[PDB]
From a paper:
L-BC virus persists in the budding yeast Saccharomyces cerevisiae, whereas other viruses from the family Totiviridae infect a diverse group of organisms including protists, fungi, arthropods, and vertebrates. Totiviridae is a family of viruses with monopartite double-stranded RNA (dsRNA) genomes, which contain two open reading frames encoding the capsid protein and the RNA-dependent RNA-polymerase (RdRp). The capsid of L-BC is organized with icosahedral symmetry with two subunits of capsid protein, named A and B, forming the icosahedral asymmetric unit. Decamers of capsid proteins are stabilized by domain swapping of the C-termini of subunits located around icosahedral fivefold axes.
Furthermore, we identified an open particle of L-BC that lacks one decamer of capsid proteins. Three-dimensional reconstruction of the open particles, with imposed fivefold symmetry, produced a 10 Å resolution capsid structure with one missing decamer of capsid proteins. The opening in the particle has a diameter of 16 nm. Overall, the structure of the open particle corresponds to that of virions and empty capsids; however, fifteen capsid proteins, two B and one A subunit from each of the five decamers that border the opening, have smeared densities indicating their high mobility. The three subunits are located further away from the particle center, and the B subunits are also shifted away from the hole. The total displacement of the border subunits is between 9 and 11 Å relative to their positions in the complete capsid. The icosahedral asymmetric unit forming the border of the opening contains fewer resolved residues than those from the remainder of the capsid. The structures of capsid proteins from the empty particle were fitted into the other reconstructions. The domain swaps of βU strands between A subunits related by a fivefold axis and the existence of open particles indicate that capsids of L-BC virus are assembled from decamers. Furthermore, the open particles may be assembly intermediates that are prepared for the incorporation of the virus (+) strand RNA.
Residue numbers in the entry:
A (entry chain A): 400 to 598
B (entry chain R): 499 to 598
C (entry chain B), D (entry chain A): 1 to 658
The structure:
Amino acid sequence: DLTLVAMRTGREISLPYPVSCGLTRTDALLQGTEIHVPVVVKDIDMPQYYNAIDKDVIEGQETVIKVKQLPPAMYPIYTYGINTTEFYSDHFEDQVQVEMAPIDNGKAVFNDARKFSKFMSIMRMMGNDVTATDLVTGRKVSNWADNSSGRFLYTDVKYEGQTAFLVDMDTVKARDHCWVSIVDPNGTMNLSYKMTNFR
Amino acid sequence: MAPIDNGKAVFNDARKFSKFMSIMRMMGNDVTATDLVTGRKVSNWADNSSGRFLYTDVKYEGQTAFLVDMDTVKARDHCWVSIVDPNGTMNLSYKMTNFR
Amino acid sequence: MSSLLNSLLPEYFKPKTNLNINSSRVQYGFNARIDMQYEDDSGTRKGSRPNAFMSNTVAFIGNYEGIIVDDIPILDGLRADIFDTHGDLDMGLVEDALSKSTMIRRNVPTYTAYASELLYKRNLTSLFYNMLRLYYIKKWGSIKYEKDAIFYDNGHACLLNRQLFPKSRDASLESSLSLPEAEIAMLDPGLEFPEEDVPAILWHGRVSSRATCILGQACSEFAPLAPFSIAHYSPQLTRKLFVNAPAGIEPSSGRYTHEDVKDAITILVSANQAYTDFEAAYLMLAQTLVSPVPRTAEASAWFINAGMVNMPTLSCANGYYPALTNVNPYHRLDTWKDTLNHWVAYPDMLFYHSVAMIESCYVELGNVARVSDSDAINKYTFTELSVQGRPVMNRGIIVDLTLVAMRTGREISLPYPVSCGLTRTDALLQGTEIHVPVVVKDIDMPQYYNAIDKDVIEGQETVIKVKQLPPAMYPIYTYGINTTEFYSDHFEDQVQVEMAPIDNGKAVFNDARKFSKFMSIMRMMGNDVTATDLVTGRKVSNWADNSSGRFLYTDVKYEGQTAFLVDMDTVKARDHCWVSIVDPNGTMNLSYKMTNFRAAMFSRNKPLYMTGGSVRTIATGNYRDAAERLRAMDETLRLKPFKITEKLDFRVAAYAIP
Amino acid sequence: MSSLLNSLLPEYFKPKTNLNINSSRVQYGFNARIDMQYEDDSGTRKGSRPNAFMSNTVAFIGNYEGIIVDDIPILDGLRADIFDTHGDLDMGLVEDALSKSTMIRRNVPTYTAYASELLYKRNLTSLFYNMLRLYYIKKWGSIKYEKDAIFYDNGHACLLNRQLFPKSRDASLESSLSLPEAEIAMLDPGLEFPEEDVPAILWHGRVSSRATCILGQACSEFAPLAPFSIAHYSPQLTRKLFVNAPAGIEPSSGRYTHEDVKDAITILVSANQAYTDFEAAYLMLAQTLVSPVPRTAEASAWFINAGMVNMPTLSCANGYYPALTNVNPYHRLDTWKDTLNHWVAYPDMLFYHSVAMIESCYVELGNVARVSDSDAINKYTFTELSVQGRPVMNRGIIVDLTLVAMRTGREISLPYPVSCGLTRTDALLQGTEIHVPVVVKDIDMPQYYNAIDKDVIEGQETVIKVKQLPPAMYPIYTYGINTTEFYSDHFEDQVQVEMAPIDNGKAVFNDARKFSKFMSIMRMMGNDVTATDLVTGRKVSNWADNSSGRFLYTDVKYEGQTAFLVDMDTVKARDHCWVSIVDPNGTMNLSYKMTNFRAAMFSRNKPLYMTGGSVRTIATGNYRDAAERLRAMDETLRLKPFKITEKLDFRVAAYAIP
C-alpha cells in the first residue's frame, strides 16, 4: 500500500522498521482469471451494454456479468493534477479537434482511441448524452456510465479489440442543466474547458 | 499490413486501404472487402480496361472502416512477384518503360 | 534461452505471433532465384531458374523415454544477504537471516540444520517441463497418428509407422494420455519438522479449482499409446506436493483449458522466483518438441533406438522457510527474466526456435560422423575439449549446445552448468552396422540399396545395412552463415571440373572430388545422370532427394575408395532451363548467383499461412543500475567453437582450434 | 583439522557436496592416457590406451575395539580472566570470579574447594565421536553385509568374510546396532556438594524431545552384529549425564532423523565452547570410517587381529560452574572454529578426507616395513624423532599424522598434543609370522604362495605364512608428488633389457631394480609374463592384481639372491588395447608417458557421479568480513517510485525507473 502511494505522489516513503502487517488489496489482480459478479436487472435492453451471461433477460431477474480486466474503482480527486497521466486526463486545461466535412451527414468514425475518450468526456461536462456503436464487434457504449465524477474512462467500453467507433451527431440528447447545445454542426469541431478555483 | 485476427484484417484508415488494394492489383490478386457502415462488398477488380484502383470504386462518400477477406484472395493474373500472404511493412517499387 | 535460439533464424525472416498447426508434418524452406552461367570448349550458354523451392520436412513423431537423475542446484531467487562477498552460499549467514525474521527463536537451531541439507538440492525444471507439455497437448490436441501411414517414400523403398514404432495404435493427441492426479495437500504453518522426499512451493492468494488439477497431473506418470514428441514416457516426479497458501486450496475440478495452464505457470514462477529454472525447461523442450523426417532411407538409423531424456529430481524448500525468499533476490545475469517474458507474450514462437535447434544439431553431426577416430577432436572427445565449466556429466543439453557453437561459430554461455534433456549421440557412439527395416515397392530395389536378400518381390519386408550415418537434414535456416566444401551451400560459387574421355558411351571418374563436382553441376542444370560403382556393383543417382535440390557424396552409400563408370548415353532431361546442355566438352565452368529469398511453409500439401500481428522485440540490457561487472566467470558454462579445416581426401573431415 | 586433510587431495580433483553411497565397496581412482612404445633393432611398435583406470578398492568393514584411557585436559573454552600470563588456571582469580556471579552464597566456599580437581576435567572428544557415528549410521543406513561374500579373490587364492570375521550374522547397517538409552537427569542448581565421576554439560534454552534420545544413545555401549567400521565395539562412556538447563528436559521421543543429530551437535559445541574437542573427534573418525581392501592375497596380515581404538574418558564440569564460560573465551590458535564450520556446510566431504588419510598411512607403512632394525630411523623409533611436543603416549593420531608428514613432506601442527584414535602399527612392531587363512581355487597354488601344504585339492581351507608385510594400497591421490623408486610412480619411465641373438629369447636379470620395471611396463602393454627364480626354484607372475595394474618387488614373497630367468617365447596377450612382442632380437627399449588426469569413482560395477553445489576453501576471513559488513544498510523501508510513461497505443501502461 505504501509503494503504491510512492508511485502516485512521486516521493520517497521511509519507515523506521520494515513491518509487514495490515490489509492486502492486490488479490483479485494477481489471480488473473474471470470474476463472476451478481446483478439484478432493471431494463430489458441490458446485455448489449454489459458483457452479460444471458442475451435476453426479463426485468427483476438475477444475472451474472463476466469481468476480465479490472476497471478503476475510484477517480483521482485529492490527487487531481499533481502527477497527471493521459489515461485519467485530470488536466486543468484540455482540448479535442474532431475533423468532419459537410459531405458527411453528421456521422464521424474515430480511428484513434485517445481522442475518442476526450470527446466523449468533454461532451458529458456540456450535459450531452452521446451513444457510440463499435463497427467491428457491434456493441454500444454510453458516456453517461457514472453519477459521481462525470468523466468517461476508456475501460467503460468493457472490451479490448480494434478501434472503429461510429458516433451519429443527430441523436445527441440534452440531459443535465447548465449545458451548451449542439443543434446542427458543420465542418471541424473544437471543444475546450478551464477549471479556475477549488473549494 | 493490419493484424489478421481470424481470416479478416480491419483497415480503419482511408489512405492505407487505398495503397493496400493498389499493390494487390499490380501483383494481380482479386481481393474483396466488406464496408462495415453500409454493409456492401467492394472489389479492386471493378474496371478491366484500365488496370488501376481508384477510391471512388467503394461507392460511399463519407467515413467508414473496411473488413478485408484475406482467406478468399483469388489468383486471376500471376507474375513471379505475385504473393498471397503479406507480412509486416509492404514495399512495392515498379518502373514503366517501352510505351507504344 | 530466447535471445540465443532467436539469433539462429535468418536475418530476412521475422515470423508473426500465432501459427495454427493442424497436422503431424510441416515442410519449411525458401523460394530463391538462381542465375546460372555455363562455359566449356564448345561455347557459352546463359539461363535463369525463376522459382526454386529448397525445404526440409519435420514431424511430431519421436520415441523418447524419461529417467529421474540428480543434477546441480540452481541458486537463483534466494535473498542476496545469505551469499558472502564471493558467489558462495555460507551457512553462517543463513542462521543470521532466519534469526532476524522471527519472534519465536527456539526453532532457529532446528531450522538451520534442515535448511543446510535441502538448499544444495533445489530444482523446479522437471515440474515446468511437464506443465509446458500439458499446455501444447491441449492447444494442438487434434493431430491424428495413423499406424498404416508412410514415414519415408522415395519410389524404390518405403518405411511404414508399423515399423520403427511397434506397440502403437491409432489415436489423437488428446486421446493418447489419461493422466492420474497426485495429492496436492495444504501446509499448515506450525509444523516444525519438514517431511522428507516431499517438496513445498509458495503461491499467490487462493489456489484456484483449475490450478489444483494442473499441478496434480504435472507430477503424475505419463503413459502414452501413440508415439508423440510432447507425450513421451516420463516417471512419477513425486507422490505428494505441499502448497504454503495462506487461503486454503479448493478440490480438483477435473477439466481445464490451455489458457488456464498459462495462469498456473505465471503465478508459480513469480511466487517462487524460479525464472532460471524455467529457462532450463524451455531449452529442454526445444530439443524434444519436433523430430526430423529423414532426407534418405539410410538416415532412419538415427531414430531406431529410443533416446533417453534426463529429467532432474523434483526438490524445493520455499514452502517450509519463506524467509529465505524475499524482495532482493540473487541473480548472476541481469537478463534473467527474458525467457519467461518472451514465452508468456508469444507462446507459438517455440515451434520456430525448436526447428532452428534440431536443424543445427543434425547438420553438424553429418560432419562429426565422417571424422576419422585417430585425431585430437573425434566423436568420443569433442564435447570434453569444448566445455569450460564443471557439470555432473557431459550429457543432455551440453552435447546439443556444443553442436550449435560448432555450426554458428560463436561462444555460447549459460549461467549454470545444467545437464538435463535429450542425448542424440547414441546411434553414433557404437562400432556396429544398424539394421533399418524397409518395404520393397519396385523389383529392382537390391541394385540401389545395400539389401540382405539380393532377389525380392513387390510387397516383401526386407532389411538394409547402414555402416556410416548420412546427414538427416540439409542447411535451410543456417544457409551460408559458414560454408563447408561437403554441403557447398554458397550464395555465389564458380565450380570448375575437367570432363573424362567418353570411350564408348561411358566416362570413368577415378578421383572422388571431381566426381562430386561433376554430378553437382549436372543437377543444377537438371540432368538425371546414373553411374555404376565398380567395386560394389551398385547404381548411384544424383536425384536421391527431391525436397533439397543438391547432391551430397554420402548418396553413393559406400565408405572407402572406389571408381565410378558414368552412363553418358542415358542422361534423362527432368527439368530444363536454357542453360541446360546434355553433351559436356573439355573443362566445365558453372557460375551461379542466389538472390530474392522468401520463407514459405507447407502442411498437408497446401500452403500454411502465419496469422496474428508482428512480433515486437522484448530484451533487457547488460546493466539495470549495476556499477561494476563482477565477472564471476568460475561457475558459468562456456562452449568454444571448432572450425572445419578442409584437406585433400574430401571423404574425411577434420576439426581445428580457431 | 579440515585444513591439513584438504591439502592431501589432488589439484585436478574438484569435489562437490553430495555423494550418494548405496554399497559397502567404492573403487576411487583416475583415468589417464598412456602412450606406450617398444623399440628394437627390427623396428618400433607404438600403442595408446586413451582411458586407463588405476583404482584402489575401499570398503566400509573392519574389526575395531574401543578402550577407555586417561588423556590430557583441553583448556580452550574457559574465560580468559581466570588464566595467568603463562597459560594455566591461577586459582585465586577463580574464587574471585565465583564470588562476583549469580551463585548461591552458601555454596561458594564448598564449590571453590572442589575447583582444584573438577576444573581440570575437560575432554568431550568421546561424546562428539559417538554422536558423529550416529549421524552416518542413519544417513548411509541401507548398505548391506552378506556373510558368505568375497573379501578378496585373485584367481589362485580366495578369502571369504566368514574367515576373517567369525561370530558375524548378515544384516543391514541400520539393523546392526540396538542401542539402549542412558539416563539424562536435570541438574538441581541448589545441590550441596558437586558429584564427581558424573559429567554435567551446558545447553541453550530447552532440551528438545529428540536431543534426549540422541544424548541417551551416544553415552551407551555399542554391541554390533555385523563387523561395520562406523558401528565398532565401544564401552559405556557413562551411566548418568546431568544437563544444566533451567527449561526442563522433555522425555525421550524414541525416533530421530540424521538432520536432528546435526542440531544436537551445533547446540552442544556453542554452549560448552568446545571447538578443539570437536577437531580431535573429526580426525579420530577420519582414520576409522573406511578400511582398505588388500591389494594382494598376502596383504591381509594387517587386518587379522583387531586394532585398539583409544577413546578418552568422558569428563566435563561446566554444569557446576556456569559463570566460568562466557562470550570471551581463551584460545591458542585464531582459526579454532574452522573444523566445525567445514563439517556443518559439507558433511559428506569426510569420505574424501578419510580415504586421503588411510592411503597416505598404508603407502608409508609399505616402505617403512622394508628397513633393517640396525639403523637410526627404523620400525620402532620413527615416531620419537619426528614428534617435537609432550604427548602422554605415542599412540592414536600422533602415529598417523607423523606418517602423513613423511608422505607429503610438510610440517603438521596441532594446538594440543592429544593422543586418541586408532593405532595401525600393531602387526609391524610384533615382528613375527602371521597365519592368514585361504580357500584354494586351482590345484597349482603352493608354487606361487608360501603355503603350509605342497599338494592341496580345490575347495580346501589352507594357511599362507606372511613374514614381511607387503603394501596394502598403491599411491593414487599422492601420485608423483613425493616419488620413490620402490613404487616407481613417475609420469615418464624407461627400461633397457640387453639380449644377443645367440640367446634364444632367454634373459637372466642379475639386477633386481630393472626386473621390477620390466615386469610392470609389460603389464601396461597387456602381456602375461611368468619368471622363474634359478636359486630357489619358485615362480612369480606380473598379473598379481586387478586394481592398480603395476608390479611391486614384494610380489616375489621371498628375500634371497636375484637370478630371474624369463623365457620370451611364452609371453601371452591377455588384455585389450595392447602392443604385441611377436619375436624380439637384440636390445629391447620399453617406455610410457602419462599426459592428463580425470577423477573417476566406481560402485556396484557402475559409475558413481558427484552431485550438488561446488565445494569452496572456507577461510576464517570469509564469514567475519560479513560481520565487518554487519549488513550496515540501516533497516529502514525506503520505497522508491515509478513514473508512468505514455506511448502510441495508450490502452496498455508502461512504467520507467526514474
